[PDB]
Each structure stands twice: as structure tokens, then as C-alpha cells.
């Protein structure tokens, strides 16, 4: 059987996001891409760099916002600037949320040598597509 990026059927109680509810053969058909950048187009360069950046960004954002991260990150790259769009549970007081917004934006702007935008969309609890 194909195990790739699949959430196996449970006893029927298992809450599932729209994201996790669709296997790899459904990309570009039903679910879209979690990253947007030019580097994978036909005549273009530095796909490798954008990829390693991507990975580090997911890992980093997951570690910087413990427990409040709802869905997988959305990374949009436009003309040297990267906008990170995130779905975030309401856990921390807005004080901590802003603290980490600024801290992260600054830190990654100085790390990757480009302007970093961070857009937080807050949601009460994980949005459920299926089962449950």
C-alpha cells in the first residue's frame, strides 16, 4: 500500500484537517502548494536554496510557537521578500504573540538577508474537515 503522507482511517473518531485528508496524488487537483516560489519553473535557478530555506522555516516556526501552530505553514516568495502565513490556535496572550511576531521577523530578516513578513491568522481550535 501507499503510505506516503497519509492519515490512516481510525475507528472513525479522528479529527482531520483539509490538508491531511488528501494524499499526494491530490496535489494540484484538490489541495494546492504550501510553498510558492519561482525556482521550480522551467528556466529558473536556486531551487535548492529555496528548499533548504523552506525546511528551516517550518522547523523554526514550529519551535518558536510551541503548541499553538494549527496547520502547516504557507510560504509566499515575491521579489526578494518572503511572507509567512500561519494558522495559529489561541493559546498565548496577544503580548507574547506580538513579541514573537517581531522577534521572528527581525531574526529571520537578519538571518536570510531579506525582508520577512509574518501574518498570523488566529483560530479557536483546529479546523476539522473530516471524521470527528
Amino acid at each position: 500500500k501507499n503510505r506516503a503522507a497519509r492519515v490512516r482511517v481510525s475507528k472513525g473518531d479522528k479529527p482531520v484537517t483539509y490538508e491531511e485528508a488528501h494524499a499526494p496524488h491530490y496535489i494540484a487537483h484538490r489541495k494546492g502548494w504550501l510553498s510558492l516560489h519561482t525556482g521550480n519553473l522551467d528556466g529558473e535557478d536556486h531551487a535548492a536554496e529555496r528548499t533548504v530555506e523552506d525546511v528551516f522555516l517550518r522547523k523554526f516556526m514550529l519551535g518558536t510557537f510551541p503548541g499553538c501552530l494549527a496547520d502547516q505553514l504557507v510560504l509566499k516568495r515575491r521579489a526578494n521578500q518572503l511572507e509567512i502565513c500561519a494558522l495559529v490556535l489561541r493559546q498565548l496572550p496577544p503580548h507574547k504573540f506580538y513579541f514573537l511576531v517581531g522577534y521572528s521577523e527581525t531574526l529571520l530578516s537578519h538571518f536570510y538577508k531579506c525582508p520577512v513578513h509574518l501574518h498570523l491568522q488566529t483560530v479557536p481550535s483546529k479546523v476539522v474537515y473530516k471524521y470527528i
Binding site: 499526494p24 496524488h25 504550501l34 528548499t51 523552506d54 502547516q72
Partner: protein, 101 residues
């Protein structure tokens, strides 16, 4: 930490080979030419073989960037097929998709 000792050894190889690139190019210019006398190219041969062993480009290995895998690498992402597929199958590689035709 580079994921493996092997990855470390290859980072050192790429640094050394980047450093001596000029020397090697200039000497192998003499060595690869018919116009110059043989007496010059023999001394130039001993000169380029004198150079540190780890500075020559044929000892460099393209390895998976994340996982260190010595082969089964897609050069464009510098990724092992395994790691590549992992990333692509989660929708994390823009424009990449399963192929139906």
C-alpha cells in the same frame, strides 16, 4: 554539526578545491597545451601532482544536503530521492506534483 563525518570530509574537500582552483587551472593550462615544450610540461606535471590530494575536483561528491545520502540525488534540489519525495508528497515543493498522463 554536518549530519555525518562523510559530509564533513566533503565540506573540507570543497573548501580546499575552491582555494587551489587558480593554481590547478594555471598549471593545467601548461599541461594541456601542445605548443609548449615537453620539458616544461613534465615539471608542470610534477607541480600539479605536488598539490594537496584533496584539492582536486574529482574527489568531490554531490551528497544529499539534509540526509547526507551519497547517491540517488536529484541535482536540482541537491536532495536524496527519499527526502525529496517526503517534501514533495506533503505539498512543500512548489510546482512539483504526481505525474498522470
Amino acid at each position: 554539526y554536518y549530519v555525518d563525518w562523510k559530509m564533513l570530509r566533503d565540506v573540507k574537500r570543497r573548501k580546499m578545491a575552491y582555494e587551489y582552483a587558480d593554481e590547478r587551472l594555471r598549471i593545467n593550462s601548461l599541461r594541456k597545451n601542445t605548443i609548449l615544450p615537453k620539458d616544461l610540461q613534465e615539471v608542470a606535471d610534477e607541480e600539479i601532482a605536488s598539490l594537496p590530494r584533496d584539492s582536486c575536483p574529482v574527489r568531490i561528491r554531490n551528497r544529499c544536503v539534509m540526509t547526507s545520502r551519497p547517491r540517488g540525488v536529484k541535482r536540482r534540489w541537491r536532495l536524496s530521492r527519499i527526502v525529496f519525495r517526503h517534501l514533495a508528497d506533503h505539498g512543500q515543493l512548489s510546482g512539483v506534483q504526481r505525474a498522470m498522463w
